[PDB]
């Protein structure tokens, strides 16, 4: 139940985006200039972080965020495009960096003069490196026919892309949307645009295996960063939690229960095998032997002893059981659902229903496990009593 309300991640590489967004760090807004080409095993995206400065949204959005969590950092490979014969700078009033500044690693391809023809440049790039390439591009919806005719000229606008696994076509709707793509090695990612195309400048490449965070607390590197949640870091050997069912990382199993206590000691009666409450009526305090014991009382040599021979074997059995169960699994959960920007309602209802049923079965497994292990410990300690008696 107890959590540390800081992102305590000493010893492994960490990036605090803050105002930066993780969908930002591909695009390069003014809030991600120092995190444009980051490289770490952690991403901390905050609630206040906006991924774009110009208004707009990502199409196929949560899946792209789930890819960029699993990146290990980004190695931006400089895509070799030049765009000869057209204007490149398209800085808008919405983004502020030393005045007018657009995205650093894309380009608003705009005509040289207003109300003029847009040459139909059909760009192409090949992934020479033996790694999948994250290719991004953006489409600027005009918002009106006047802005379309002023910027990209009159007439209908048709922009298409093309790959071996992606030949899906676009049209502007008379306010920039970005659309990602997986580019295989030895494959070509051919664009074809007639204006209203935020052309990319550099290609995104994954580095390793990062596991990201969505929270609001600050970063304070002092711990080992095993498991995380939306308000800090929870690190323990305990197999179950109660704080948040959306914990991402090497995280314990969420339960509906408040706190399930495993009876790691034996049945106690203060002042199920047979005679736990039999001729040996009640437990007696004057004995120091552990979670078992053989207290002594005499008539000529009165004093308390301890039968360490079976007791230490019993403690080794209980501690081996403890190290078996408190051993946490190696499974790595990911951040499927989002708490800052909500997912689509139907898929989110499926996700909540699946997650609630998973917590039902894990809570019932935890309750039944605690119950059977309590019965196992009591029956075991009664069995060492019985074998001592015989």
């Amino acid at each position: 139940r107890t959590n540390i309300p800081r992102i305590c991640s000493k010893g492994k590489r960490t990036v605090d985006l803050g105002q930066c967004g993780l969908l930002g760090t591909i695009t390069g807004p003014p809030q991600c200039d120092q995190f444009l080409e980051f490289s770490a095993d952690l991403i901390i995206e905050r609630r206040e972080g906006s991924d774009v400065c110009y208004p707009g949204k990502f199409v196929n959005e949560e899946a792209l965020r789930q890819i960029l969590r699993e990146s290990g950092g980004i190695d931006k490979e400089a895509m070799g495009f030049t765009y000869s014969g057209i204007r490149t700078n398209g800085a808008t009033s919405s983004c502020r960096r030393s005045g007018s500044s657009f995205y650093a690693e894309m380009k608003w391809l705009l005509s040289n003069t207003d109300n003029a023809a847009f040459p139909q440049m059909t760009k192409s790039y090949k992934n020479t490196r033996k790694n999948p390439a994250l290719i991004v591009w953006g489409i600027h919806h005009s918002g009106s026919t006047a802005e379309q005719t002023k910027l990209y000229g009159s007439g209908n606008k048709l922009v298409t892309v093309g790959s071996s696994n992606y030949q899906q076509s676009f049209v502007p709707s008379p306010r920039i949307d970005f659309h990602w793509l997986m580019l295989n090695p030895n494959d070509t990612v051919t664009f074809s645009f007639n204006g209203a195309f935020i052309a990319p400048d550099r290609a995104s490449f994954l580095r390793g295996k990062s596991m990201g965070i969505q929270s609001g607390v600050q970063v304070d590197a002092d711990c080992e960063g095993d498991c995380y949640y939306s308000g800090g870091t929870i690190i323990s050997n305990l197999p179950f939690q109660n704080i948040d069912s959306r914990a991402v990382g090497k995280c314990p199993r969420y339960v509906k229960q408040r706190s399930l206590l495993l009876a790691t000691g034996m049945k106690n009666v203060p002042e199920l095998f047979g005679a736990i409450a039999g001729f040996i009526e009640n437990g007696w305090e004057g004995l120091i032997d552990g979670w078992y014991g053989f207290r002594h009382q005499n008539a000529q040599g009165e004093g308390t002893a301890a039968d360490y021979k079976s007791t230490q074997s019993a403690i080794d059995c209980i501690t081996g059981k403890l190290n078996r169960l408190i051993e946490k699994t190696n499974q790595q959960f990911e951040l499927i659902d989002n708490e800052f920007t909500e997912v689509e309602k139907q898929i989110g209802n499926v996700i909540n229903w699946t997650r609630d049923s998973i917590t039902e079965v894990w809570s019932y497994n935890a309750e039944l496990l605690v119950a059977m292990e309590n019965q196992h410990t009591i029956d075991l300690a009664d069995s060492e009593m019985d074998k001592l008696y015989e």
Partner: antibody
Amino acid sequence: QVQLQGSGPGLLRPSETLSLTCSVSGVSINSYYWSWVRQPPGKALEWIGYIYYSGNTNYNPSLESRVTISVDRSKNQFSLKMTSVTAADTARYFCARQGIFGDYGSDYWGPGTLVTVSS
Amino acid sequence: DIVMTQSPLSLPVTPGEPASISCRSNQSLQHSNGYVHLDWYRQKPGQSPHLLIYLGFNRASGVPDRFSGGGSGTDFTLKISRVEAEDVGVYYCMQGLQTPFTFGPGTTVDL
């Protein structure tokens, strides 16, 4: 819009190792991958081979053992070194980038570095 | 190695006339994207050449409208609407589908 510029020895005796250099602006050998070509005296233009900005090279099968291209990433120039120079290697080396590799912007052929074998 | 065949050899063209030069390959030129990898550079005698047509049959950036070489399959034909003073040039047909990037014998156009 990049600007290409070439330089190197002109009067060169045969058999020894040839030197060449070529300076570029703008792209700075940081994004697109360039290449070298060879034009024998008023003959058929040939393609020496391309070099990735990363460094991976791919020369023309016709001549491969006698040709090596310098990456030179830090400096804003890429050089060419040809071994076993011959009267056949007499040529007008051009330094450039091409359409078909992925950039669709002209070629920016650099100035001809005319070479001779003399004696 | 793809031998690129240029047709014809020379054009003693008269001023103001449509001039068309073709270039056939023994291998059909068609990139996976569907945009044929073929170019139409033109070398000014004793100087650095200039690309006139790119990606099979597409008007090149900063290139006069007269030049609009088309073609299909393995045989592509650069065409010019009129003949002018700057027209003089040894035209080369670049492929680009595979490596080697072969050119052409050239077309010595003149008045």
